[PDB]
Amino acid sequence: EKMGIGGLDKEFSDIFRRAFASRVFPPEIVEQMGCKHVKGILLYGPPGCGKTLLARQIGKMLNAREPKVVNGPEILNKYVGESEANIRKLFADAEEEQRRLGANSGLHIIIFDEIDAICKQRGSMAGSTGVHDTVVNQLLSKIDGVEQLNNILVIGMTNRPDLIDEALLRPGRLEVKMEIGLPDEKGRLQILHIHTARMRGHQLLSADVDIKELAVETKNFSGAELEGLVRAAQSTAMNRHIKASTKVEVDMEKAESLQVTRGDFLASLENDIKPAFGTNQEDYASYIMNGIIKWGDPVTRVLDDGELLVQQTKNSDRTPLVSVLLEGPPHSGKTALAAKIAEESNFPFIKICSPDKMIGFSETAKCQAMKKIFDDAYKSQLSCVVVDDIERLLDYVPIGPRFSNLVLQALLVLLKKAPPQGRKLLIIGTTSRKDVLQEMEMLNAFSTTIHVPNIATGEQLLEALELLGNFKDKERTTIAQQVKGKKVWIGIKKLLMLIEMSLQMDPEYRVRKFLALLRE
Amino acid sequence: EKMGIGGLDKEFSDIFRRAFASRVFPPEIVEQMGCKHVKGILLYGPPGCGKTLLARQIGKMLNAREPKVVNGPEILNKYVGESEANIRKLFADAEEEQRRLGANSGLHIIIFDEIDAICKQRGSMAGSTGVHDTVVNQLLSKIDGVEQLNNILVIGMTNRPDLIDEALLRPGRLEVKMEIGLPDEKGRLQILHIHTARMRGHQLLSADVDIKELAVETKNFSGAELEGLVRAAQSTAMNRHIKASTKVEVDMEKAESLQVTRGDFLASLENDIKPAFGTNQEDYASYIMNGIIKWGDPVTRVLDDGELLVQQTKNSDRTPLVSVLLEGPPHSGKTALAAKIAEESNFPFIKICSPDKMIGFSETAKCQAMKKIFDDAYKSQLSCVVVDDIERLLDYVPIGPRFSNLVLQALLVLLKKAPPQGRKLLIIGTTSRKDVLQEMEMLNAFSTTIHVPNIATGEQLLEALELLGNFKDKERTTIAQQVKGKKVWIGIKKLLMLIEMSLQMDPEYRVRKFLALLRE
């Protein structure tokens, strides 16, 4: 078969049909009317998807018996002038079979590793001291002219793909460059089944651990991200019910091999493996501080228009990109309702583009950071992006109005830039100044808006205060004798200010302290 | 059972579960219930908390006997190109257990003493001739395929966490990114108990020396900030015993003994003024130069509404970020009331963000120095940052009113940026221009404001003049006749200008000058 590779069947059976496909079955047919074989394979990917696991395995499944593994910068560090000589001493042991042939999956491989250390010169003369180019075109020309080997396979990999030389990406040199992305929901029940297979115990981990329960809520992070989930829990199982009393002067195995329980894994994804991507815990709980109380009908009227528009994103093909805009008065709770819509949306990739992780950045350094978030939402099938607090990305201020034009015209594009075809993106935006964006025609950019009001009547003010539950029934009555019939207009976040400044007074005085602060 | 590390019972037992739960305990169930061992630990921190203590101690409680201790920029040494000769001879002796001794000991450690000067990988390779892009992935690919079980355990530590390359912190290479901060109240009677253990007259120093009483008032500053307390207290007790002007060594101990008193510790609390985290009157008395006299209820209404709002920060968990804005006319003693609210609050961390230390800074350097102050607040349990004199940080001037947009957008974010979970902050703002900060939408951002007024009546002027104690009782009688009838309006700082400008006249003309300058 192969050693365990999870969720890469549309790639490993795709470098079947470019490299593996020849060289075993058609040497009686290519000898009739064939052509040259493949030359080399490139491997895209964010770190953690399983690039290197292929070259450990395709260096062994090929039965080649000479895996000439090189590191990336392993060549460069010789004396100045003689740097380029190592790679031509690397092909030369293969190059003696210029005169021969063979059978059973042809047997010379060269494996680079993060190849964009050597293979720089994307077209911008990247580097100096005259070596950053000469080790490129030494390597450009050992696999084209003159012809050789017809039996090597330069399996390269990298993390930064589009910086390799474009003359080294043509099919004469590296035939197949291939996107190895993170596995989907179907791919993560493949890979959990692999790293919990040599585990036997009672039965293959335990009796209680459902890997399908660990498939769906471990919902986006990649391969070695997921290997660390198993490896941490069985390490917590090395401190649980057999070794929970190690007490650094250790015991031996006295309590005899506790199975890795279900409480191990959901403590390990609780603490401390962040998915580093970051999905299903980006700490959106910093934005939803005091929960989501349904203080009125205009809360339910907002978040149902979440799912009546989230399901527009999940089940369409006419509109691959839906961009909504939450608006309303300040302190009204828009960032929470942008997160609570996005968290209850159950998309894989939920990234809150909040400007607090961008403080002090210039007009360029925000656009280079917003580019990184929207490219991380282009690498997913289903993704949501909260572009939070529009008037702080645009560094806006109403004195003679100044703002960033450079961020604006790199945000008016990204509300109308389609993803790769077949991929869905939900953009949620929060703003407190609607009629500023009415000038800049960003209301024209969003698909539709959702007005988030303040608390409207005195019934909602009590209903916001019943659910928080801070005041006594007699103490609620005095406020009920004031605002019932009056006209209050104040946000929910500002209501959390006025409740909490009120409690720090005397216990008989916590009522009209709130009623003094409510007047403004 | 273990050599001294103070107050890191959680963090040191959390690398028990990572690089200490496997690899030693069962030690044959690991190969039965298959599992790779972890490849290293990452140590965050503010400077001086026991990051390098957790290399030297962890290199001696492993019984590993060969810590390959490298330094931070140690590797980079040779000519350009030649740098990676060190970071592949670094793993080379541990590579040589890829032998017939494949498993089974196992000689591990490599200590990156300051990793952030090696690993950046900024993704756009903005660096000439290969500075920080080929020492990174030579390192990224000598700890991956092809690999053994394997031998190594790479411990890297840094003052600056996030500037490390995000490709390297995957669960393959460096699993745990462990937070080593400043210790709490109970962690410090661990570390005072460690360094004063060998300190002895018999086993301890004296009787009046109690570390548990010095645990609670040396409250904020970290471990290396606290060993300097112990070392400079016995240093004070040297010169208490010996005499030192010349090379004189003459004792041959004069009391025939030596012990360190409690008065020798708190002599070195006038030095070591809780550096970089905390104050014990740490020379912010240059903002209160002439005291805070209470000339009426409009001072007591100011410094109690501060200390009520301090109770909101300390007790509450609904609103973990509380902000205030002391406002009023110029020369009204606003800065001095802000430091007095902070000094009467007994917070650990009281840093004053002030424009007087920022003279001549450009618009970028005002944001990053303001960002450095709040990031020190975010590394404490409690904190209170006095953002003083808003319209000088914003470098405001109202002729076609020009200001720094970038400072205002690095200030409207930080007044709402929440500290991490369980930590508090109290931002106190002073400004002279209520209306201009309304025009910038900043009075929106603060929770509440306190109008600090001028003295408005003749009675408050006479009461302010008694408490200073400048004039004479018959001379104040001349003042008491004149300042009544008409109502005056002047600040408290401007009042201190006029009194000193009036004392320097002739003594027969001090009073008839002070009543002349006060006409405007």
Ligand SMILES: Nc1ncnc2c1ncn2[C@@H]1O[C@H](COP(=O)(O)OP(=O)(O)OP(=O)(O)O)[C@@H](O)[C@H]1O
């Ligand atoms: N699809 C997969 N199936 C099984 N295991 C996987 C898969 N993807 C990743 N892994 C795990 O990831 C670990 C190493 O992956 P790899 O080194 O390829 O990450 P990478 O970032 O792609 O490589 P590099 O770090 O060299 O760039 C292996 O231990 C392997 O168990």
Ligand SMILES: Nc1ncnc2c1ncn2[C@@H]1O[C@H](COP(=O)(O)OP(=O)(O)OP(=O)(O)O)[C@@H](O)[C@H]1O
């Ligand atoms: N139904 C609700 N909708 C929104 N927020 C709520 C609700 N119920 C309670 N809250 C609390 O109110 C707070 C709202 O804070 P939030 O920053 O979202 O207000 P905001 O209007 O976005 O302020 P700003 O616009 O200045 O960022 C959250 O901490 C949340 O816990």
Ligand SMILES: Nc1ncnc2c1ncn2[C@@H]1O[C@H](COP(=O)(O)OP(=O)(O)OP(=O)(O)O)[C@@H](O)[C@H]1O
């Ligand atoms: N928890 C602790 N217990 C005992 N001593 C400590 C503790 N924390 C710090 N120290 C003291 O701090 C000193 C070194 O501190 P630390 O290891 O934090 O330096 P560092 O910040 O790691 O320096 P660098 O990062 O440059 O290596 C030692 O003298 C050690 O005794």
Ligand SMILES: Nc1ncnc2c1ncn2[C@@H]1O[C@H](COP(=O)(O)OP(=O)(O)OP(=O)(O)O)[C@@H](O)[C@H]1O
């Ligand atoms: N009751 C009081 N309140 C405030 N300040 C007082 C009081 N009594 C005396 N002072 C003195 O008044 C001085 C005012 O200092 P401060 O810098 O606060 O003035 P200010 O109003 O902030 O000036 P500016 O508005 O120009 O910054 C302080 O040195 C303080 O010692």
